[PDB]
From Swiss-Prot, chain A:
Disease as annotated in the protein's UniProt record: Fanconi anemia complementation group E: A disorder affecting all bone marrow elements and resulting in anemia, leukopenia and thrombopenia. It is associated with cardiac, renal and limb malformations, dermal pigmentary changes, and a predisposition to the development of malignancies. At the cellular level it is associated with hypersensitivity to DNA-damaging agents, chromosomal instability (increased chromosome breakage) and defective DNA repair.
Coiled-coil stretches: none
Species this protein is from: Homo sapiens
Top-rank taxon: Eukaryota
Summary of the function given for this chain in its UniProt record: As part of the Fanconi anemia (FA) complex functions in DNA cross-links repair. Required for the nuclear accumulation of FANCC and provides a critical bridge between the FA complex and FANCD2.
Compartments where located: Nucleus
Subunit structure: Belongs to the multisubunit FA complex composed of FANCA, FANCB, FANCC, FANCE, FANCF, FANCG, FANCL/PHF9 and FANCM. The complex is not found in FA patients. Interacts with FANCC and FANCD2.
Record's comment on post-translational modification: Phosphorylated. Ubiquitinated. Phosphorylation by CHEK1 induces polyubiquitination and degradation.
The protein's name in its UniProt record: Fanconi anemia group E protein
From Swiss-Prot, chain B:
Compartment(s) of residence: Nucleus
Subunit-structure text: Belongs to the multisubunit FA complex composed of FANCA, FANCB, FANCC, FANCE, FANCF, FANCG, FANCL/PHF9, FANCM, FAAP24 and FAAP100. Forms a subcomplex with FANCB and FANCL.
Parent-protein start and end of this portion: 656 to 712 of 881
Name the record gives this protein: Fanconi anemia core complex-associated protein 100
Function: Plays a role in Fanconi anemia-associated DNA damage response network. Regulates FANCD2 monoubiquitination and the stability of the FA core complex. Induces chromosomal instability as well as hypersensitivity to DNA cross-linking agents, when repressed.
Length: 132, 30
């Protein structure tokens, strides 16, 4: 995946076909825990777009472990934005890794959440309330 | 330079005891 992921997604016209393969890659029951962490750790350094979010959604559906610095970088990139899969991403973090979420992360969340170009605005507001 | 600290005392006090953008606009006739 160090060979495959980076270039495929740095590539333009990275179509839905390829995202679905990478989605099935991260859905691999055989993708072992430390493997999932290195997948994540590698995803972090990239230019994040719609495809990056779509992948990462399925990646963290596994409820995979995050170090605090790594969750920090996550929420940092996550702060920056109308995308609906990106809405799914923010929702999934807020729901699951609330165990990991703090107030300033919740604030940067609020900043990125303010948009109405978003969908599920309400749901996110309720989740954000529940974090507080 | 895109076209070419903090208060000691108020900090000291804290140490001794133990986001959005603003906006402004106008409109004028041509």
């Amino acid at each position: 995946c160090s060979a495959l992921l980076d270039p495929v997604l740095q590539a333009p016209g990275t179509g839905p076909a390829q995202t679905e393969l990478l989605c099935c890659l991260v859905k691999m029951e055989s993708l072992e825990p430390d493997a999932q962490v290195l997948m994540l750790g590698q995803i972090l350094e990239l230019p994040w777009k719609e495809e990056t979010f779509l992948v990462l959604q399925s990646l963290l559906e596994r409820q995979v472990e995050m170090t605090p610095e790594k969750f920090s970088v996550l929420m940092e990139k996550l702060c920056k934005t109308t995308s609906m899969a990106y809405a799914k991403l923010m929702l999934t973090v807020m729901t699951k890794y609330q165990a990991n979420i703090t107030e300033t992360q919740r604030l940067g969340l609020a900043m990125a959440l303010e948009p109405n170009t978003t969908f599920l605005r309400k749901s996110l507001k309720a989740a954000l309330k529940h974090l507080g | 330079p895109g076209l070419a600290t903090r208060d000691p005392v108020a900090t000291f006090l804290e140490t001794c005891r133990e986001l959005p953008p603003s906006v402004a606009s106008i409109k004028v006739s041509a």
